Design an enzyme around this catalytic site. Structure first.
Site, mmCIF file in Angstrom:
data_model
loop_
_atom_site.group_PDB
_atom_site.id
_atom_site.type_symbol
_atom_site.label_atom_id
_atom_site.label_comp_id
_atom_site.label_asym_id
_atom_site.label_seq_id
_atom_site.Cartn_x
_atom_site.Cartn_y
_atom_site.Cartn_z
ATOM 1 N N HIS A 1 0.812 -1.219 0.000
ATOM 2 C CA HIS A 1 0.000 0.000 0.000
ATOM 3 C C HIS A 1 0.845 1.268 0.000
ATOM 4 O O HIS A 1 2.038 1.190 0.159
ATOM 5 C CB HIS A 1 -1.060 0.011 1.109
ATOM 6 C CG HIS A 1 -0.535 0.113 2.508
ATOM 7 N ND1 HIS A 1 0.239 -0.864 3.103
ATOM 8 C CD2 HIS A 1 -0.793 1.031 3.477
ATOM 9 C CE1 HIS A 1 0.457 -0.537 4.370
ATOM 10 N NE2 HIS A 1 -0.154 0.612 4.617
ATOM 11 N N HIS B 1 5.632 2.080 4.034
ATOM 12 C CA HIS B 1 5.684 0.896 3.168
ATOM 13 C C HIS B 1 6.167 1.196 1.764
ATOM 14 O O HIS B 1 6.521 0.274 1.074
ATOM 15 C CB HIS B 1 4.339 0.161 3.096
ATOM 16 C CG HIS B 1 3.780 -0.156 4.444
ATOM 17 N ND1 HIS B 1 3.757 -1.432 4.962
ATOM 18 C CD2 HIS B 1 3.239 0.655 5.389
ATOM 19 C CE1 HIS B 1 3.236 -1.393 6.183
ATOM 20 N NE2 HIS B 1 2.919 -0.139 6.469
ATOM 21 N N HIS C 1 3.445 -4.705 10.471
ATOM 22 C CA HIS C 1 3.946 -4.185 11.757
ATOM 23 C C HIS C 1 3.986 -5.238 12.868
ATOM 24 O O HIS C 1 3.226 -6.216 12.867
ATOM 25 C CB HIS C 1 3.092 -3.017 12.285
ATOM 26 C CG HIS C 1 3.057 -1.819 11.392
ATOM 27 N ND1 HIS C 1 3.892 -0.736 11.557
ATOM 28 C CD2 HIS C 1 2.288 -1.544 10.314
ATOM 29 C CE1 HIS C 1 3.620 0.169 10.631
ATOM 30 N NE2 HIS C 1 2.651 -0.297 9.859
#
Ligand SMILES: [Zn+2]
Ligand SMILES: [Zn+2]
Length: 283
Positions: free
Chosen positions: A68, A73, A200
């Site tokens: 995403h 990221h 995460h």
């Protein structure tokens, strides 16, 4: 204090869990059959990926994949690609078409596949956390039983889900249904060798949530959640990633994923699946 770890799938490929930033995970896919490398969710802190390659691992570093658009990221895509073309390349940057991901050269949509060496990377649309979030399902076509790596970004964590920044509980229900039924075609035989690589290190907080919220205190799923929680905590204590869990495991410990099980929806008694997702999210 955060360590790397490597999950290996038969003799076919491996996935290295690379801790980045404060609590992010980036990943390095390594196809053993062709010595082709791909990185997943490269952020501003990308040097640890390179450090790993130059302790541990001629190789071809061909692909970057972003689950995403969020900077934690995608913030290293352009920089790592530059590196990378200067030292080799052609570097392909894969991202969900509807997320406009920085430096993307291969926009993807549901059902798309890209190769990383001989590995197949299948794309699953999972809009919610961002409107263009995807999941990457990676396996070796010639060694399907060696297992599957599922990169879930910020859609699904161990025992958890991402915040609905650009979507809602219906979107998340749909994503959980897609994940739950990935292996419907093989009567879920591959669930036990499908490993979940999320965005995460949020496992601790979500596992505490599962332990508190699990509705059925007579089931050994409660004992399982408690054992798993301690196991992940011990990992985290020595600097080891809590990840990956298997999809088989998530189907027990991840209450959000279990919204895709009609029997679990009934058991929770918080309304229909949408109502239940809202309850768990709120909650
Ligand atoms: Zn995010
Ligand atoms: Zn994130």
């Amino acid at each position: 204090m955060r360590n790397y770890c490597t999950k290996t799938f038969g003799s076919a490929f491996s996935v290295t869990v690379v801790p980045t930033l404060k609590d992010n995970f980036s990943y390095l896919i390594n196809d053993h059959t062709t010595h082709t490398l791909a990185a997943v969710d490269v952020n501003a802190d990308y040097k640890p990926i390179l450090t790993y390659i130059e302790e541990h691992l001629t190789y071809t570093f061909s692909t970057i994949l972003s689950t995403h658009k969020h900077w934690d990221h995608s913030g290293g895509n352009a920089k790592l690609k530059a590196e990378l073309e200067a030292m080799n390349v052609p570097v392909v940057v894969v991202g969900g078409a509807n997320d406009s991901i920085p430096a993307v050269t291969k926009p993807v949509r549901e059902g798309d596949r890209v190769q990383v060496g001989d590995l197949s990377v299948e794309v699953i649309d999972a809009p919610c956390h961002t409107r263009g979030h995807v999941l990457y399902k990676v396996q070796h076509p010639q060694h399907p039983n060696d297992g599957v790596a599922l990169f879930t970004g910020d859609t699904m964590f161990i025992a958890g889900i991402g915040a609905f920044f650009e979507g809602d509980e219906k979107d998340m229900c749909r994503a959980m249904e897609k994940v739950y039924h990935i292996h419907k075609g093989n009567d879920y035989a591959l669930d036990k060798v499908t490993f979940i690589f999320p965005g995460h290190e949020y496992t601790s907080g979500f596992m505490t949530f599962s332990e508190k919220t699990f509705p059925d205190r007579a089931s050994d799923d409660l004992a399982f959640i408690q054992a798993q929680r301690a196991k992940y905590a011990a990992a985290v204590k020595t600097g080891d990633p809590s990840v990956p869990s298997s999809l088989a495991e998530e189907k027990r410990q991840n209450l959000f994923l279990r919204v895709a099980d009609p029997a679990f929806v009934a058991k929770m008694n918080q309304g229909n699946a949408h109502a239940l997702m809202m309850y768990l999210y709120n909650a």
